[PDB]
């Protein structure tokens, strides 16, 4: 079939690699592996090394903090492709087999496995102004030559391919998500009730999300308005643990309800990036070049995963708010409200191939 190749500026170091993506099963990932070809005449005595690096930028290199860098590594691995590691004999994949068959004798394989609990390749919306190597997590594979591992990385004789690791929707749909609450106040004993639910548990990007809500206004008060929202809780792990929260989409409704009455309705709304350009810090599902990706898909974390190592984690929650009037013998436009949240999942199905920034 087709495979991806790329040769170093020195024209003599080329890498061959089948799939750019590497799907991530809940506890398994496609082993990332390829074959590198070089003109031995050039290689007087140097050794050829290929390295996988999982970097994580969190501050643009132009940042002003003295000394403190902004590029943490999560996992790197090195392999001396040539000399072809006699003691290290690997079970060459059939892909490497066929590649070897095609190219000459001067090609040599390389094969990295991946730690299971690692983040999907995501990048944070770089906003209008800044440029360069964008933020977020990233996976690269370099190939170069040197006699010493710590020696300088002479640019013209090395080549690197970016790589993305992604996940697809769990084939078995989960339990239908929902929640409910009640609120009472110093006025009387009649806590109004509020239940909310979702059509299903997993949604594909653009699948219209439908909230179903019911409310029983027992108390002698009036709900002024309703505000439904879909928010992107994006946890960032570092030396510290911080969490951001960006409202990805929303809607509101002036469906007032009288005291002691009741009401119910289904609303709907769709998360989508189009109208969410300007919001910096938003998380995107990773890019190779500046290809406009889609709203970063929720990380289907394995239950009880050791999220401490996980650089970035993403999750999407819908949230319903009922704002009411506290007026009366003591009250005005200023008043309190109720809110309830339902987490869910937003991912892709399991297709047979991905688009390399086309159309």
């Amino acid at each position, epitope marked *: 079939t*087709r495979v991806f190749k790329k040769a170093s500026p020195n024209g003599k170091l080329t890498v061959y690699l089948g799939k750019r993506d590497f799907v991530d099963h809940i506890d398994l990932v496609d082993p990332v592996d390829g074959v590198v070809l070089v003109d031995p005449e050039y290689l007087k005595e140097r050794r050829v090394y290929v390295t996988l690096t999982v970097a994580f930028r969190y501050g643009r290199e132009d940042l002003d903090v003295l000394g403190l860098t902004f590029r943490k590594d999560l996992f790197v691995a090195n392999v001396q492709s040539f000399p072809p590691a006699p003691e290290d004999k690997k079970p060459l994949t059939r892909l490497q087999e066929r590649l070897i068959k095609k190219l000459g004798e001067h090609a040599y394989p390389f094969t990295f496995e991946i730690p299971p609990n690692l983040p999907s390749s995501v990048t944070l919306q770089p906003g209008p102004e800044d440029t360069g190597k964008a933020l977020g997590v990233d996976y690269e594979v370099k190939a170069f030559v040197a006699e010493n591992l710590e020696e300088k990385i002479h640019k013209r004789n090395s080549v690197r391919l970016v790589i993305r690791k992604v996940q697809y929707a769990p084939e078995r749909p989960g339990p239908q998500p929902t929640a409910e609450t009640t609120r009472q106040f110093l006025m009387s004993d009649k806590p109004l009730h509020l239940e909310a639910s979702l059509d299903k548990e997993i949604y*594909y*990007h*653009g*699948e*219209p999300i439908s909230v179903n809500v019911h409310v029983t206004n027992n108390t002698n008060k009036t709900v002024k308005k309703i505000k439904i929202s879909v928010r992107q809780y994006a946890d960032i792990v570092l030396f510290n643990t911080a969490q951001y929260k960006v409202p990805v989409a929303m809607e509101e409704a002036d469906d007032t309800v009288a005291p002691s009455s009741t009401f119910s309705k289904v609303y709907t709304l*769709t998360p*989508f*990036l*189009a*109208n969410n350009r300007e919001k910096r810090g938003l998380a995107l599902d990773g890019k190779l070049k500046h290809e*406009d990706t*889609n709203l970063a898909s929720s990380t289907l974390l394995r239950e009880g995963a050791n999220r401490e190592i996980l650089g970035i984690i993403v999750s999407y929650k819908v949230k319903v708010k009922l704002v009411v009037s506290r007026g009366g013998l003591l009250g005005d436009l200023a008043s309190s409200d109720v809110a309830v949240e339902l987490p869910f999942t937003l991912m*892709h199905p399991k*297709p*047979k*191939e*991905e*688009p390399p920034h*086309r*159309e």
Partner: antibody
Framework: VQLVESGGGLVQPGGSLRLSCAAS????????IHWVRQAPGKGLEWVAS????????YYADSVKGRFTISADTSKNTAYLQMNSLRAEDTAVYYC?????????????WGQGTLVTVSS | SDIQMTQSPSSLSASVGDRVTITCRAS??????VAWYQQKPGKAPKLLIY???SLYSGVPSRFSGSRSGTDFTLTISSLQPEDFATYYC?????????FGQGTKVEIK
């Protein structure tokens, strides 16, 4: 699964017409739209494209700016006010959906509509 | 640029039960980003194969095709009467998405 299309007919040069088509069972935010020309007895000619989930549109270099495509999410419909007819536009026009994620070809086609420029 | 396509041949007469090939070359390298569609007279066309290899779900596997450099090509394994129609190739790697001159299947 179906996809209706209408809003076409006979128009005068330079004129305008908002040919539209609706997607029964397609959240527009997951299925880009395109329109494509067929000159009667000639090869198909892509015309325009809209991708709601990015707001991007792309028009035919032949008539870049001459027409204007758009969409209506509230009804899951797509609009195209063809304007300023350059006479190379008299043809049949189809509107079709991709998968706005992971383009895999024009998997579904409305019945199109014949739109010709004349006097 | 505006990549051009060349559907060769431009017409074809053939017989029932025959296995037939039709090609089209691209003015550049579009890297298998091509789809083959069918269209009968009057009716609206339908996709047949996307990515130049994968047959669409809902087609008989007698259709096939492959890519060699800038030249892709499809084949039918046996021309049924339902298969006598016009066939288009169309790349998509480079906006805008041009088709080819196409190809029309005639009776022997």
């Amino acid at each position: 699964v179906q996809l209706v299309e209408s809003g076409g007919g006979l128009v005068q040069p330079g004129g305008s017409l908002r040919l539209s088509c609706a997607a029964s069972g397609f959240n527009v935010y997951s299925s880009s739209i395109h329109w494509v020309r067929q000159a009667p007895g000639k090869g198909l000619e892509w015309v325009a494209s809209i991708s709601s989930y990015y707001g991007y549109t792309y028009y035919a270099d032949s008539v870049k700016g001459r027409f204007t495509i758009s969409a209506d999410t509230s009804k899951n419909t797509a609009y195209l006010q063809m304007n300023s007819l350059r006479a190379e536009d008299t043809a049949v026009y189809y509107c079709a959906r991709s998968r706005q994620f992971w383009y895999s070809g024009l998997d579904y086609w409305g019945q199109g509509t014949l739109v010709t420029v004349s006097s | 640029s505006d990549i051009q396509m060349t559907q060769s041949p431009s017409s074809l007469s053939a017989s029932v039960g025959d296995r037939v090939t039709i090609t089209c070359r691209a003015s550049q390298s579009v890297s298998s980003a091509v789809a083959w569609y069918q269209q009968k007279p009057g009716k609206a066309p339908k996709l047949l194969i996307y990515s130049a290899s994968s047959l669409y779900s809902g087609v008989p596997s007698r259709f096939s095709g492959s890519r060699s450099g800038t030249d892709f090509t499809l084949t039918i394994s046996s021309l049924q009467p339902e298969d006598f129609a016009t066939y288009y190739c169309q790349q998509y790697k480079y906006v805008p998405v041009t088709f080819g001159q196409g190809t029309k299947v005639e009776i022997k």
